[PDB]
Each structure stands twice: as C-alpha cells, then as structure tokens.
C-alpha cells in the first residue's frame, strides 16, 4: 500500500509559476499525488495519509548544475591535487559534502568533472546519502587545454587521464580525461557513459586564468566537438561546454552542444542562437565572484581578470534580459557555497527572487537533458524532492544561505531532513550491520 | 588558555585496574590531565572548567584491532570487489563506517587491509570524523596467497598489486599487496609505509574457507617473512600476521611478528612462546561465529565438516590462551561501523573473560595491536590521550550493553566531543568544511 | 609608483621602418617608447621627469634573429644523434651562455625553430639568467623518415624518444623534435608544442639540405597533415613556420596556410607573387648555404657537392628574385643563440641585394611577423612599441658588418631595462644573485 | 619511502621516473633522485650514478628533517643494502656521503662502510670516536638548520 504524506504550505512556490497561499502537497511514494489549494485536497488522501506536516514556506528542492566532484586533499593547490589524491581520499571527503548539500535543500547535483558516478553507487545503495547526482565522469580536454596540468610533464598526464594504453589502475575512470582527434574522442565520450555519466562536459576554451591557455581561444576542433556531441546524442545525453570567448562558445553552439557554462563573452548574437536552439545559460557567477574578492597577481593579470569579469556580468544580465534559458551553478564542491549563485542571479544578474528560483528548479533540469525525469517543480506527477523552509524567499533570496531555515528535506518521496529525524534520514540504519 | 572538561562518574571504569566509584576525569586539551575520586579533583580545574558533565559510567574509548577498511560495492561476493570497486565509492562507504563507529564509541581501530591511510586523511582534516586509525595499508600475500584472488587470471591480479612495474593509476596503493621473494617484499613493506602505515599485515597462512588455499599450510618463507619484519622494524612498526594452522602461526613467531590474527591452532606450546616474546593474541571470534551461524548451507558436506572443526580449535586455542594468560586484544574482522560490540560478549561468552577482562582487552591492552606507533591510551590515567566514552549502564554487570549504541551518550575523541547530548553529527563545533 | 623615465639622445636613429632621423631623440617610460622625434621636440614632461639621460652616436631597435635553435647538444655525436644523446640539462646550462652572448651582440629577440626555447625561456623571465625575447616552436613536427627524424638510430628509439603514442616518464612530449604521423597524431603534436609554451609552430615541410637521407625537392607531411597542423596552430593564434626547399614542398605549406617559410631554396616568380598575396614571410637563412660553400665539398663525394652548389645558386636566385619582387622577409641564420647572427645581415646585403635599411628593416621591424599574432608590438623605435633598443658606436648603414664587433653595442634594452651599458655588470642594471 | 621519496606524488609515478627497473626513453636513470628497493635494485642505483660521472655517491640513511612523511630518528636502507652500496662505489674508488640525523642512521651507515655522514644531528660521544677511528667526515650543514 502507498505511503502517502500530506504537507499543508503557508507560501507554496512551485518552481514555475505563481506561489500559492494556504496550500497543501501530496506525496504518494516517490512521486507528488497533489497540488493546490488547502481545500481541495482530495479525500482520499485525508483518508489514507500516514502523517502530515504544517511548514511555512514549500518549494521544489534546489539543483546546482555546476558542481565538481573533487574530494582533493589540501596540499597542492592547482590541478595537480587531482591527480595526486587518492579517490578514496576524495570519496570520503565527498560523502561530508552530498551530506551537506542534503541538509541545505540541494536535491540534485550536475557534477561537471570528478568522482560524481562512483560516489553516487554510495548514495544510491543506500551506504550514504546526498543529492541525486548527475555526473559527467571526467570533463574532457584537449592536450594543453584547460583540463592539462600544465605544471606536470604531459607523459604523466597523458598516462593518468589518456584513452590510450589500457591498463591496471582504475584507467579510463578520473576527474579528467584527455583525448586528440576524433578517434579518441569517441574512446573519452564513451569511457564516461561507461562510468555511468548522465551528462557529457568538454572545455571547449581556455580557463577562466589566462597564464597556461586563454580564455579566449576555442579548445577542440570543430571536427572533435561534432563527434562527442553525436556520440553522447547516441545514448541520450547532451554535452556542457566550459567556454569563455566568443570563438569557444560559437564553436560549442555550431557542434550541438546544449548548455554552456561560464559564457563571459556572450552577446546579442549569442543570445538569439541560444535561444533559437534551446541552449542552457549557466553563468556561474560564484566563481568570478570569488576573484573579485580576491582583489589580486601582477597589475596586468589582475586587469585582464577584471575586464573577463565585466565582460561576463554584461553577458549574464543581457542573456537574462533576452530571456535566454538560465538555470544555476556555482562550479564549487559538493557542500560548497551554492546558495551564493541564487543570491548573485538577484544581485548582479537583475532576476526577480521568483526567477532564481526557478532557475535553482524548474529549469535545472534541462541541464541534463534528456536525462531528466519529471522534476524540478511541485506538480503532480513530478518527482518528490521537496523542501520546507521557515522564511520567504521572495522576500529575501540570502535565506537560502542559513542552513537551519531549511526545515524539511524530502528527495524521492523519502524525508532526509525535518523534525526528530537522524542526520541519516529517517528510518536509517547502519548498513554495516 | 588550556581548554579544561571535568566529568564526573558514577563508575569509573580506567581499562587497566578496578573500577572507581564516584570518581571524576579532567580533561586539559588533548589528554587527562586528573583521574580519581570526586573528592581529590585540584582545585585549579574546578576553577578553570569550561564545563562539567555527570554520567553513570564512564570508561576508556573502545578498540578494535581487526578492521579492515574495504568500502567495497555488493557486486562480486569474493576479493574481486576489492579489485574492481572504484576507491571513490569505497572513501565514500568508508565515511558512513567511521561515524557509525564512533557514535558507538568506537575511537581506535585498527585497519588490516585497505585505504585507511587515504581515509584518515579525510578524518585528519577534520572533513569527516571517525576513530584514530591506524592501517597497514595494504595486507601482504604471497601469489597464491590468502590475498591473492584466485577467481582472476594472475596477470591482472599482480598488473593491479603487484610490486613490479611502477605505472599511472594509484599503483601501490590499494587493499592488498603481492610479493614474491625478498626484494620483492622489502617493497611491499616500503609502499605501505609511504602510504602512512601504522602496522605493518602480512597473510602467513592460508584463508579460513578451504577452497583454494589451505588455512593448515603456512604462508611466505621464512626468509621472506624475516625481511618483512626487519622492514617493519626499521619504521618502528610491527608486523601482524593472518595465521590458522599451527606451521604458519610458529613461522610467523619465528620471524619476529608482534601480533597474530585468528590464531586457530593455537597450543599450549604456542601460548607460552607468545607470553615469552610478548605476542599479542588477537581472535577475531565473531567472523567464526558468523559462518558457524549460517550452517553450512552452498558449502560441501565434508568442506563444512572442516569449518567446524576448525570452529573447535578457534574456541579451545582461545579460552586455552585466556587461561595461559597470554595478553589479549579484541578485533572482529569486519568493516568499519560493524558489529564490533559482539567480540566482547565473544570474550565473555566464548573465551570466558571476566566482563572487566573483556573491556581490558578492547582498551588497555590494544594499543599494544600497533607497538611502538601507539601514544598512551587506551587507560582513563593521567598523561594519556582523552578518548573516552560515557555509558549509561554498567557493562560489568552485561557486556551486551555495548550493542546499543544509544547507551554510549558521550564520545570524546583526543579531548574533543563528537557525541553527546546537544553536540551535532559531526562533533562539537562543526562547521561545514566546504565553506 | 612614478614611472621611470630614460631620455636618450642620437646623432643618427633607425626607426627600423623608415628614414632615419638625425639628432634625435627617443623616452622610454616603464617598459614601453614614450615618444620619438627629433632633440627639439622632447614632451618637457619627460625633460622633468627622467630618472637618467644617455647620449649615443647611433640608436635603433634591437636586433631580431627568426631561425635560431636551442639546441644546447655536447659536442660528441655530429648528427642529430646528439639532440637525443644530451642530457637537457647539459643543453640548458649552454644555452644559458649562448642567450648571454645573444642580449651583448644586440639580439633582443629570438624565434627558436627547434629546441629547449621554452624551457630555457622561464629561467629568462624568472631572472635567473638573461637573454631575448624568445620565441620558441617547443619541438620541430615533423613525419617518420622527415627531417627531423634521426636516420642514423633505429626507429623505435626515436619515436619511443619523440614520438606522441605512448606517454611515459621522462619528459615525454618536451623535446627538440617531434614525430607524428596521420592527422590524429600531428594534433597532439602540435598541441604538446602549445603545452610547453610554444609562440610558433614548425614542420618540416621538405628533405633536408644535405641530400643524403631526406630529399629537399620532395615535400614533407600530406597536404592532410599540413591543414590539419596549420589549424590547429591557428585556434591558439600561432602561425605555422615551414621548412622548404623544394617547389613541392614550398607549394604544399603555402596551400596548407603555413606563414613563414624558412630556406625556400627553389621559390620563383610563382611562389614570390603568392608569397605576397597571402602575406607569407621569407626567411632565406643564407648563413647556413654559406658556411657549406666555404666547406667546399669537404669529404663530400663530387656528385654530392656539385648538388649542394646548385641548390645554392637557385637558393641565392630565390632569395634575390624575392627581394626584386617585394616578398616581405625577415633575417634568420638557423644557428645555436649566441651564434653569428650579425653574418646574415651582411648577407642580406652582399648576396641578397638588400640595402643596409632594408637588411635592418628585416631584422626590426618585419621579423616579428615571423610569430604572427604572438607579437607584440615591437621591432620599431616608435611611439607605443616595446623599449627593445640599442645602441651603437658606428653608423650601421655606412658598413654592415659592424653589427659583427659586439663592442660596437655599447648599449642593451630590452623591455625598457638596461642589460648592456657603460657601468653595468654582465647579468644587467640593478642585478641581484637570484641564489640568495 | 625513504626521504628522497616523493610522497605527495602517487608511487608509480615517482618510481615511473625514478627507480631503476623499465628502461625506457627520457633520459631514464638521470635524475637528482633514485629509488632503488633491495640488493639488487641498489647496485644498479649505484651503477647508473657512476655511469653520468659521478664522483662520490650519497644515500639517504634516515628520514628527513621535518619529521613528517619519514622519521628522522630511523634509519633507512637496510643494512644489507647500505653495504652493497658501500661495495660498489669502492670498486669504482668512490666513498659514500650518508644523510643521517637519528643515531640509527648514523650507526647504521658508519658499519657500512660510509666516508662522509651529513648532519649528523644525534652525534655524540660514541659516534665522535667512531667517526675519528675509522677517518669518517662530519659535514654540519648547519645552515638548514640555521
């Protein structure tokens, strides 16, 4: 028989479209039975329900669609840690942060380049929890792109986190995967789907730095990019590209890749085709954010880094004015500071607290394609991951930033957070018994 | 300014020695700074606490000396899921297994094959929490050895264990190790160590089962098994040596290993060298309950027959071994956040410990489980390391208390609180490490 | 916080592109030319200003050299067998003295060809040592049994060294040379060039000059490769420098999209006129056919000879054909740093038919178009451009050959930092020892 | 894991370019470090020093200084391999220079057979006399410390 959950709403915000006063959800299983107002909830449902909830504030739990499952120990502080950290260093590190990012309301994750895959076998059987996970596997790169260590002979990259010359050691399964040529190409797409990966992520230009590739150069030949697209096409997924100038981010476009990240130099044209082809918008402001902070560097590094970081916000605000589909990342770890990105879609993105929110959900989900099942809203028929919060977020997007005022956590129907329950979700066990 | 807790016990239990009564612990930092009666507490802690605790019983933090740190998926039933399963997924698992394991008070464990080097990394930065763990990176077989798994073509065994042919993709580290002959192994030993090893595990005998090598026959040579423990010796570590048959357990002794898993064919002659050369004896007594448990059902008639018999030597080498007085620690064989508690009441109830015999065994006496590597714990003394747990209900009097979990209220850890009433699953003072 | 601000004053200056000027006057501010222009007309903000003044007879700008190769090799192996054999670090302690000798003689910039350029380079920015500006193509690319592949040495040991299959310890992809064959591999190729910093691509677009293994009359790399190469050079704004001799070859880089050619010993009125339609560079290297003909068939058998002074005529008639004709070139000498570069401009003169100007002009201001978009602006005493200057004792364009007496340089900037002056110690103004 | 071992780097990829098994191309056994495991492996490790021209041999006989991958206090090599090493630098006339700080190490590379002893931090009364009786070097370096 199912479980049924009743939850009475204060402010119901359903992801896309207008709140709801005084409403109420159903959960059945792992699917939402209901929405609407408190009255018409059907009888059936008073009837069978096994408890019910009062929360002031309800809404579709939070997606983050730039995340990187690292896991990295401290000690090196480029992309040599990747490398050097043994993965059940990172796996362990990673099972505190899905913890933390369940307790902050984040249901789901798009991991852009890490252990995502082989982490979620540990969320999904049940040994820990966190966000439904959707993980590229490695990100792919050209030799001497942004995924290179620059700092480390290429022998010992190329040995790491090529698609040639199998052997033992976890080959074929690390947060990088280099390929050249189309041959080899087809090899990464597939090492990853291999893996598990829900998504396909290329860096298709220089990194957002400038001291080792540019940021406004593309990464990949046009040739390159056709194939991995097509070949994630083939089982169902689309391709994210990390681009930056203009020619990375047209090359990714003319390819077929369906979300973009970063985006710095977006403009009118850019907009129209991405609107035109039905493109992801993810801005990532977060990490450009951080740097500012920073407030450098050489004089001239600093200035360059200045000009991408104007060049961007103009990018996201106009790709939001020409209303481009948006949704949020952050590009940070698991448990990282996500909720910034929202914060920043109001603040330097010119969203309404209503449209942030419905980029961190209703949106989120074509970030994976067609991947996605039905999610990412409190409709009927869509998936159950819902939570409470005891403040409005509409009148202020940085609630989102207090752990403790998200109240309720529900993903799959299944309560991970609320009242008397255990940091393991309810009815937890240890699995090592 | 030192950071000083005073708690105050119904039952003092101190892991060597009898139980105090109305007795109070402080701790400054780190270590226990007072242990004694309620009425002898120096009047500087009085003054200087930031908090005092009362609790019924209150004891050493718990040790077991037999983990072994696999995180392995439910794929493959044998050692192949230790090959196959991606060590993320593993780290992963792991991290569940040490905070159960601490919640159940649980604050050293020592780990005999595995990433529990690359694990307590993760709990040394503070990102995830869980016991001191002490690992010998990877337990040392020979080919067709107990670590080797014999369900795998050899080429793809030692191309993944194998001490030969240094190559990308986290070679020398991962549960187990094969070596072949002295060179070999003087490797082997090495690339624990440069994992961080605390101990150092070596497979002297063949696996309990029976099927593919023999739990009778010994394992190494002797010239091999020397080397292992002169390598050991040099790091100040010991060597710990997996041993069933009577050949294994006396090559291993021969050899100078300091401490000695299973140990099924243990006699009277065995017991009294290990009291001579200060060999500890550890049973691991719940991994041969749990196939005595499942009664023989996908086993052979006479391949049964065998694991019974076996069970019967464990049982008699063991309460033999209590009874010589040769010094004891507990371990269960099992995986972090397992059914450690049951090797207590293993002891109890098999062995035939006292219940205070009992919990010596899991505290006092187990830091002698890693030698030279160990600090002063283990003991509710002055000068040692503050792991130490609160219980609500005296052991003594039922050494089963231990299986609720909900009976451990306070864990302190090095001096801090990782469980107790109003502290948050990851310890006193968590803040999200990600931030 | 000021900025530091140097006013030199000229009897004669040598813009690089265009007459020069007498009593002349040229500011550098920061790293940067300030202004030029005659004594007069000095901004009077930098008459203020001016940390220190200086007055010499003749200032132009600092000498470029377009073909040089940081090699480094000991002296033990006479083919390229000691490119593999030589320990780098034998080859960059060499090179260190060799970029020394370079910044003395006047050379403010070098294109490196094939070699350590890279490497060496961030020993330069760090301070540690001095030299040019270098710009370097990491590895020469070139095809199995091309000319870079060493003949001498069994195959699997040069593509185990060079090749781009089968990544391993040892600085694999980081040498002189780089073999790869097929579309898939030259991309790689390439890209490990643009890995360790590379500012240009090179192929090896033709046999090599000594007819013995390789051919120069036959074309090296597929037109495939050659697209592929030049591509791929491309989407990270380098330029592809070719290695021609023969038309073949010469035609096939051009069709390819290759912008420097190096030698291009058989170029006639057809490759002159496409030179120039598309902008392509010339560098004749005349330093290197001129060393062999003073050889004069030394232990060469005398069809070998006869063929390598043939191949020096039409090398001499392609370079003067191109000069007559108006290709764009630049000086280049295809030797170690600290090499006699200054023989080549004298070259220019005698045997191409440059005027002095023009043969300066080549070495200033045209040759940093032999690293295309990677240039900055640079190679002319001009207002905005680089404060790459120096000067001289002598009056250059009276005898062009006294670019060959390093003490006729009596004054070294690059990046508006003296290197070479009167009272300045051998490793530059305000040197420090980087060990300390 | 001894105190030429890289340890924040992966072990296949420091014994890859270090180690003196799978000769390979790029200039493989020249470099500042050699890993060697064993007296096998050992005289190879001293070979291929005296092959670039070496002209005295050093090996790392306990840990290092900062007390944290390896001890300083324990030796390292064992004394097996430590007189192999010994043996074959005397064939070719070298001596060996031994890093030692803890006593272990210092004992350890003074049986051995070692000419020069760096640092040498726990030196005392016993080690003098044996450093004067046998015509062993003491080189401070008191500068690291300094």
């Given at each position: 028989e199912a479980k049924v959950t009743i939850i009475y709403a204060?402010?119901?915000?359903?992801?896309?479209?207008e709140p709801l006063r005084n409403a109420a959800l159903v959960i059945s299983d792992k699917i939402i039975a209901f929405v609407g107002s408190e009255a018409d909830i059907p009888k059936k449902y008073l009837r069978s329900t096994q408890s019910t909830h009062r929360v002031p504030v309800l809404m579709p739990g939070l997606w983050d669609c730039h995340m990187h499952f690292g896991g990295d120990d401290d000690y090196y502080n480029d992309y040599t840690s990747g490398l050097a950290t043994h993965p059940a260093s990172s796996g362990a590190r990673l099972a505190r942060g899905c913890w933390e990012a369940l307790q902050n309301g984040y249901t789901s994750y798009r991991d852009l380049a890490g252990y995502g895959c082989e982490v979620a076998k540990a969320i999904n059987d049940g040994t820990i929890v966190g966000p439904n996970v959707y993980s590229s596997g490695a990100a792919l790169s050209q030799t001497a792109g942004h995924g290179d260590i620059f700092a480390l002979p290429a022998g010992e990259v190329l040995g790491s986190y090529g698609v040639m010359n199998p052997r033992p050691g976890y080959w074929g399964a690390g947060p990088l995967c280099i390929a050249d040529g189309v041959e080899e190409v087809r090899r990464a797409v597939r090492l990853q789907i291999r893996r598990g990966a829900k998504v396909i992520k290329v860096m298709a230009s220089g990194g957002v730095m400038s001291r080792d590739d540019n940021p406004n150069f593309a990464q990949f030949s046009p040739e390159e990019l056709k194939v991995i697209v097509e070949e994630a096409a083939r089982q169902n997924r689309i391709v994210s590209a990390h681009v930056h100038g203009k020619a990375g981010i047209m090359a990714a476009i003319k390819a077929g890749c369906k979300s973009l990240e970063h985006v710095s130099y977006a403009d009118e044209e850019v907009w129209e085709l991405m609107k035109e082809k039905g493109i992801l918008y993810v801005a990532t402001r977060s990490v450009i954010e951080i740097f500012l902070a920073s407030n450098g560097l050489v004089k001239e590094s600093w200035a360059k880094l200045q000009a991408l970081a104007d060049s961007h916000l103009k990018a996201y605000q106009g790709a939001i004015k020409a209303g481009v589909t948006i949704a949020l990342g952050?590009?940070?770890?698991?448990?990282?500071?996500?909720?910034l990105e929202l914060q920043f879609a109001v603040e330097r993105g010119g969203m309404t607290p209503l449209e942030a929110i419905k980029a961190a959900t209703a949106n989120a989900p074509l970030s994976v394609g067609p991947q996605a099942?039905?999610?990412?809203?409190?409709?009927?028929?869509?998936?159950?991951d819902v939570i409470a919060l005891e403040e409005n977020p509409l009148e202020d997007i940085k609630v989102f930033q207090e752990p403790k005022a998200v109240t309720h956590v529900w993903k799959g129907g299944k309560l991970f957070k609320g009242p008397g329950i255990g940091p393991w979700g309810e009815d937890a066990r240890n699995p090592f018994l």
């Open positions: 204060g402010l119901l915000i359903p992801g896309d479209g952050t590009d940070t770890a698991p448990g990282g500071p996500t909720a099942p039905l999610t990412g809203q409190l409709r009927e028929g869509y998936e159950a």
